[PDB]
C-alpha cells in the first residue's frame, strides 16, 4: 500500500 | 485545491471520485482495499452512489475507468452533523476494483501514529483550484 | 469554471491543535487534524478525499477532507477526520464485514 507504481512528481514553476 | 498543480495521471492510484446517479462528481474517497473506500460522512454517500477509480484527466477518453457500485455504506455512528466530528464512513464494494498501474490501495496508520505539526504532507482532489 | 480537468495535488504542513483553535477555536475536536495556511487551501469538491503523509517511505492516510475556509482562504487552515483517531474504528468495520 501507498506506494504508487506512477511516482508522484511535486513541483512548481 | 486552491493554488495545488495537476498531478501526474495515476500517480494518486488510491484516489476515487464519488459520483451521483448523474455522473456529478460531489466528493472524493480514497481506496484502502480492493472492496472498500474510505470517505467523509458529510458527504452523504448511499448505494445509489457510484465509486470511480482510475480517473485522473475528465477531459480524457481515453483512460482505464472503473465504475464500481456501492454495496453498503458504514457511516461512523459517532458522527455529528453540526460539530462535523468524526467525519468518517466506509464503502464497501459489490465488485472488488481491480488493482492496476492506476489503481491501487493507500496506507492506513496505526492509533498510536504520531504525525507532529509541521510534517509536509499532501492532500488531492479535483475540488476549485480558486474559490 | 474553476473546476479543473485534472487531478491536483497540493504539499502543506501539520497544524498542531493548539494553533489550528487560534483559528477555530472550539470548532476543533479531537478526532480532527488541521493543515495548510500556508499558501494552500482544499476546496469545495475535495471533500471527503485524502490527506496524506509519509510512513515508512510509503503514503499513509492522516486525514480526510472535512472542511475548511468559507471561502477557500489559502491563509486560514483547512480541517480534516484524523485518521489515527478513527482507524480503529476503520480495522474493526472491515474485520466484521
Known sequence: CGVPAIQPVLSGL | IVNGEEAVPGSWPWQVSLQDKTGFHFCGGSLINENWVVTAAHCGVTTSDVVVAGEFDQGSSSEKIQKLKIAKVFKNSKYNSLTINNDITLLKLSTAASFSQTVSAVCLPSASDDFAAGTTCVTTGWGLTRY | ?97
Open chain 3, 1 to 97: 469554471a474553476n473546476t479543473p480537468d485534472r487531478l491536483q495535488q497540493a504539499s502543506l504542513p501539520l497544524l498542531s491543535n493548539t494553533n489550528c483553535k487560534k483559528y477555530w477555536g472550539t470548532k476543533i475536536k479531537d478526532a480532527m487534524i488541521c493543515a495548510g495556511a500556508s499558501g494552500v487551501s482544499s476546496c469545495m469538491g475535495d471533500s471527503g478525499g485524502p490527506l496524506v503523509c509519509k510512513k515508512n517511505g510509503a503514503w499513509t492516510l492522516v486525514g480526510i477532507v472535512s472542511w475548511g475556509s468559507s471561502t477557500c482562504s489559502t491563509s486560514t487552515p483547512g480541517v480534516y477526520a484524523r485518521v489515527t483517531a478513527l482507524v480503529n474504528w476503520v480495522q474493526q468495520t472491515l474485520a466484521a464485514n
